[PDB]
Amino acid sequence: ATVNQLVRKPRARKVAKSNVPALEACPQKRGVCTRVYTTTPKKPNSALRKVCRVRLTNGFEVTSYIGGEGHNLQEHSVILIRGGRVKDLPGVRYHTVRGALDCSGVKDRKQARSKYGVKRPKA
Amino acid sequence: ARYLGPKLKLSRREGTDLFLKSGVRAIDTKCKIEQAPGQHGARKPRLSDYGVQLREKQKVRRIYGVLERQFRNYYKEAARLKGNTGENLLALLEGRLDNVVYRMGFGATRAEARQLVSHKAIMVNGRVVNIASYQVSPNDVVSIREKAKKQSRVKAALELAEQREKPTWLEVDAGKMEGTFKRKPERSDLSADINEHLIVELYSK
Amino acid sequence: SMQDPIADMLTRIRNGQAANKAAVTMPSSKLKVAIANVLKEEGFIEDFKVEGDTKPELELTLKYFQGKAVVESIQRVSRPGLRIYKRKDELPKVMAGLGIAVVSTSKGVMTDRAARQAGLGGEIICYVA
């Protein structure tokens, strides 16, 4: 409180701790698929959510979501990951970029295609 | 860069005539003017405070044929300028060449006037100006160039114009197809069911 | 201990005023007497006196209007723990000029208004409205 006190010990803003450290302030990172599996989510939800463990080009190894309905990914699949947690999946803090590198687009999508790596259908 | 779709939809959504057609017709004989477009047009919007601000800004934009980026820049300039920002916004819009071309009656619509401009049919001070957003100044003389003078669009455009209220700040010679931007319009010259302060509110938050 | 007698002065005023007291009294000092002078001259108190020679007791006659205290706020600005000085072109004004700031200059204690008009800056002793 005292002026004297601040003069001895200045106000010191807290440094923000990141939510996607594996990215190291990069917009995406590349990595190899270590395990490709499903996992169940947290109260109150229930499903078999597709996730993968991925060793990134910078050594970090993280779990990443594989959004969309259907995917053709396996071990040694080279994928691109981006920031973005999965809320009912604790530990999951990244998303896989559908339709980049070895990851295919979602099949048969018509709405929100660009978020699922899907070309515009000839029509 | 231009809105090219159906036009009366825009009027219908904003709840008013936006003069996007010549005016040869009662607008209610061309569309269901008092009902929004779509399956749920009859539905009433219990409309939020943000909503009324948005729609008012859309209304003005749709009147003048301006997309968001340019219109935002228009707000920025109105703000920077001295005097009331809301009124400055309307001065800037009303000083556009496509607009002035419309007000002198050379085009049936601002869309038509804009085409006149783009297609090198309009001169300012005997000099060809072909960009729609060219800011016109007091004492400027805008004219249909000689070769564009026999276009039947222009004659019809001047006829309709003669049937609209006649703008004070423009002196138009229909014979010569030239006209003079005498002065910037005051606020009082422009329609009173435009709520600029809402647009000003939308862009300050 | 009693390390700021001016805050003490401000406060004795403020509290007796809040307590609808007719007058307040405190150990005197030239600097208090210089401030009391400004208050009176600007009509925030009736009048004042100092009594005694060896242990001078200063007395301020407070002022009331609509069964209200004339002094609405009275606050210490500069203080022993943080001296505040301003230049002529930096002189604060209270309530957009409706109140006053008491300023101490090379030419003695006066209001922000006075010091402003006389091309001076000084230590900002207090605000009063």
Binding site: - | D49, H197, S204 | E42, G43, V70, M95, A96, L98, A129
Partner: protein, 155 residues
């Protein structure tokens, strides 16, 4: 000619044997656009009964503020429970730049040009309470002159 503005509607709930009883609250302000402002707060099982009870309260319980050509005399601070409030007389042309709760109060009041900001809890019922009192305690170049016993230039 009185101007009235609905600031917030809210659902509260009361618990009994049978379960929860839901009701509504309404917070409003009426003003004369020329220096008079009242706020009201009503409760009712249905929203219309609540928005209506409040106007009724807002019409009486109304106070005067010493405006100055559509703007304030001097900067002012207001406080009530969680809400610290601050207002400034802006130059002409600016209009009212302020939060929703305050804007409604200032608009109906007739304060044409002001800079405002709410600190701490923006709880609408206490924000408006704090603004009204701020404007109300706001004194006038004439009353300070009266107070100080002098009609100098400052009058």
């Amino acid at each position: 000619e009185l101007q009235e503005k609905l600031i917030a509607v809210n659902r509260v709930s009361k618990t009994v044997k049978g379960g929860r009883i839901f009701s509504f609250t309404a917070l409003t302000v009426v003003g004369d656009g020329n220096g008079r402002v009242g706020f009201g707060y009503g409760k009712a099982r249905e929203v219309p009964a609540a928005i209506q009870k409040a106007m009724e309260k807002a019409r009486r319980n109304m106070i005067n503020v010493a405006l100055n050509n559509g703007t304030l005399q001097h900067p002012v601070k207001g406080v009530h429970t969680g809400s610290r409030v601050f207002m400034q007389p802006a130059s002409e042309g600016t209009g009212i730049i302020a939060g929703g709760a305050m804007r409604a109060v200032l608009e109906v009041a007739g304060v044409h040009n002001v800079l405002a900001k709410a600190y701490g809890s923006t709880n609408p019922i206490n924000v408006v309470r704090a603004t009204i009192d701020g404007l109300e305690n706001m004194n006038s170049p004439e009353m300070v002159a009266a107070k100080r016993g002098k009609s100098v230039e400052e009058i």
